[PDB]
Swiss-Prot record:
Protein name: Ly6/PLAUR domain-containing protein 6
GO CC, alphabetical: cytoplasm; dendrite; extracellular region; membrane raft; perikaryon; plasma membrane; side of membrane; synapse
GO MF, one example: acetylcholine receptor inhibitor activity
Superkingdom of origin: Eukaryota
Motif placement: NxI motif: 43-45
Subunit structure: Interacts with nicotinic acetylcholine receptors (nAChRs) including CHRNA3, CHRNA4, CHRNA5, CHRNA6, CHRNA7, CHRNB2 and CHRNB4. Interacts (via NxI motif) with LRP6.
UniProt-listed GO biological process terms: positive regulation of canonical Wnt signaling pathway
Major site of localization recorded for this protein: secreted
Residue ranges of domain UPAR/Ly6 in the record: 2-96
Domain comment as written in the entry: The UPAR/Ly6 domain is sufficient for inhibiting alpha-3:beta-4 and alpha-7-dependent nAChR currents.
Name of the gene encoding the protein in the UniProt record: LYPD6
Effect recorded for residue 66 to R: Increased binding to LRP6
Function: Acts as a modulator of nicotinic acetylcholine receptors (nAChRs) function in the brain. Inhibits nicotine-induced Ca(2+) influx through nAChRs. In vitro, specifically inhibits alpha-3:beta-4 and alpha-7 nAChR currents in an allosteric manner. Acts as a positive regulator of Wnt/beta-catenin signaling.
Length: 96
């Protein structure tokens, strides 16, 4: 469980890591936040990554969101350099 890259306004995780900006995550951050914005159909439109404390990663989960249009899922990491590309499937959590 280490830090990750602070991506922002990126078209895809691939190119995002391909460059790997020479920066460093903020303080009071142990977990890694991940937010991928997809289109209504199911295409990667944008993605954002940043470091966040356990508190911020207390409640997360990825799923299909077709309310207004674009579907974006949220999730956290548990390892170093978690800027890897995510799969493409339907998942459901309990979030009890």
């Amino acid at each position: 469980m280490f830090k990750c890259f602070t991506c922002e306004k990126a078209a895809d995780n691939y190119e995002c890591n391909r460059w790997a900006p020479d920066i460093y995550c903020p303080r009071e951050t142990r977990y890694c936040y991940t937010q991928h914005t997809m289109e209504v159909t199911g295409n990667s439109i944008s993605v954002t990554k940043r470091c966040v404390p356990l508190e911020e990663c207390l409640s997360t989960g990825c799923r299909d969101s077709e309310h207004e249009g674009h579907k974006v899922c949220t999730s956290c990491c548990e390892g170093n350099i978690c800027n890897l590309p995510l799969p493409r499937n339907e998942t459901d959590a309990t979030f009890a």
